Ligand SMILES: Nc1ncnc2c1ncn2[C@@H]1O[C@H](COP(=O)(O)OP(=O)(O)OC[C@H]2O[C@H](O)[C@H](O)[C@@H]2O)[C@@H](O)[C@H]1O
Ligand SMILES: Nc1ncnc2c1ncn2[C@@H]1O[C@H](COP(=O)(O)OP(=O)(O)OC[C@H]2O[C@H](O)[C@H](O)[C@@H]2O)[C@@H](O)[C@H]1O
Ligand SMILES: Oc1ccc(/C=C\c2cc(O)cc(O)c2)cc1
Ligand SMILES: Oc1ccc(/C=C\c2cc(O)cc(O)c2)cc1
């Protein structure tokens with residue numbers, strides 16, 4: 299279960315402020331920006347992470363229990379989830395790679411054709427026969443790609459299965475392939491609340507480094523790949539992302555409740571870019 | 576500070592099965608529709624879903640301290656967003672279904688949600704609020720006032736005064752603010768419905784205010800994951816996440832939960848907005 303319960307790092311405010319301006323600078327200059335997210339971007343909605351001070355695995359190692367302040371169904375997308383919605387909407391996010399099974403990116407209204415859900419989604423079941431996916435309003439009741447008890451309704455009666463990978467299960471080929479292509483082709487990869495400890499998910503941001511790409515890591519704890527980052531920001535991702543959006547001249551949009559967007563809409567207008575050099 | 580009785584910490588959580596939860600939220604809807612004067616009492620449990628830990632929960636400040644462990648914050652107080660529950664309370668006031676709001680929370684989230692300060696009793700103070708010792712003018716800051724226990728913050732009153740500004744955060748020995756307690760008590764006594772949300776009700780007198788509503792035939796509803804001091808006196812106890820309860824409630828009452836435009840201070844309640852017609856009940 300990897301390195302659990304590592305101490306947190308807090309950049310002092312002055313340093314925190316300068317690094318967020320540097321991130322702004324990087325977003326403005328990059329043609330292709332890919333965001334990698336993990337459990338840390340949902341901690342501010344009451345969903346514990348895995349390896350943080352009170353993470354699932356960290357609490358288990360100490361003979362304690364993780365604490366949920368929400369159900370998966372009653373969780374609201376964080377300020378960070380909604381910033382990513384807007385960043386995609388105005389063309390500043392090329393693609394979004396997530397390790398999270400908590401369903402919050404989809405329910406935020408983030409376009410599924412710009413999202414790799416590497417470890418699956420608790421609300422998503424898949425027909426074994428035709429591979430048609432169903433995005434449900436409640437958590438699918440099983441994990442480990444098991445029979446849910448429901449049947450495909452495609453004009454098929456195929457066995458529906460959860461999309462939650464067990465330890466032995468290889469990542470979905472479609473999601474990993476698009477995630478890998480996005481990462482290789484990106485000139486900026488930004489990581490938000492992941493420790494980058496899982497192979498290959500944790501390694502995707504490193505692929506951006508190939509052919510001169512830039513890596514930014516936003517995380518309260520040290521990550522597996524700190525050494526490879528051009529910029530490491532140690533603070534709460536919500537604070538980092540609200541400062542970034544303010545610098546970029548972008549509103550964080552209202553969440554109208556759980557909404558599924560299959561396909562990315564045409565790009566909205568965005569502010570003009572500052573002079574940088 | 577050190578010997579201070581911190582009460583019953585870390586009691587087991589109780590979860591109503593979904594059918595019972597759904598039935599009880601419909602009963603709560605029935606009570607709200609029938610009540611002339613509805614008063615909400617909130618504590619630390621309504622902020623857990625924004626990453627601020629409570630005091631007496633499984634992972635609360637005092638519970639964790641008892642076991643030699645630390646509470647965990649997933650936000651700063653300045654970056655915390657009001658929960659679905661905070662914003663539901665905003666709307667319930669706006670459509671005239673909330674008479675008054677009594678809070679033990681120092682986390683600044685009611686004010687910052689845009690809830691009107693003239694319908695809010697902040698019994699234990701507010702981390703973002705400093706007060707002039709000379710003229711009692713309050714200042715609602717964008718960042719936390721850096722001191723606790725009614726201490727000198729280092730800033731001076733700007734009223735057309737130069738009075739010493741002090742934090743509004745009570746220490747253990749400090750009595751409640753007289754204005755906030757007085758209005759909270761009056762609200763509570765005169766209410767025919769008190770709804771408690773995410774408080775264990777263990778603090779005197781804050782936790783006792785909801786019992787005052789029971790006087791002259793009032794009804795008490797307690798929403799809480801743990802047992803509370805006054806469970807025996809409740810007409811209705813709901814054991815679930817306050818966000819689930821309040822979203823289902825708003826749905827039943829035909830109310831949208833409004834957008835948070837970011838931290839906004841409202842000094843005075845605005846005129847009442849339209850609300851849905853009431854169902855036939857009896
Ligand atoms: N608000 C916050 N702001 C910034 N960082 C945060 C915050 N909250 C927590 N963190 C950090 O966020 C980091 C979360 O790292 P991990 O807990 O490993 O989550 P993963 O998504 O990378 O786990 C990958 C898979 O492993 C599992 O087996 C599952 O299959 C997962 O899908 C921590 O370092 C915190 O310091
Ligand atoms: N999401 C949730 N949904 C429902 N209940 C919840 C949730 N999260 C927590 N709870 C419950 O929320 C309850 C929180 O109770 P306590 O932790 O005693 O907070 P207080 O506000 O009453 O503390 C009063 C004062 O004492 C202090 O010294 C300070 O002065 C405080 O101002 C728990 O029983 C949880 O089960
Ligand atoms: O890979 C995984 C598959 C299933 C789960 C299950 C629950 C869970 C627990 C958390 O604290 C966060 C989360 O998002 C989900 C977790 C990881
Ligand atoms: O009465 C009080 C005075 C000061 C404080 C300080 C911090 C604090 C800790 C929490 O976990 C929640 C909260 O809202 C505030 C807490 C209570």
Ligand SMILES: [Cl-]
Pocket residue numbers: 362363364633634
């Ligand atoms: Cl526990």
Ligand SMILES: [Cl-]
Pocket residue numbers: 364365366
């Ligand atoms: Cl739990």
Ligand SMILES: [Cl-]
Pocket residue numbers: 368369370371437
């Ligand atoms: Cl759930």
Ligand SMILES: [Cl-]
Pocket residue numbers: 351644645646
């Ligand atoms: Cl701890």
Ligand SMILES: [Cl-]
Pocket residue numbers: 650651652653719
């Ligand atoms: Cl803070």
Ligand SMILES: [Cl-]
Pocket residue numbers: 669845846848
């Ligand atoms: Cl209004």
Ligand SMILES: [Zn+2]
Pocket residue numbers: 425426427428429430450451452454455456
């Ligand atoms: Zn099928």
Ligand SMILES: [Zn+2]
Pocket residue numbers: 707708709710711712732733734736737738
């Ligand atoms: Zn003054």
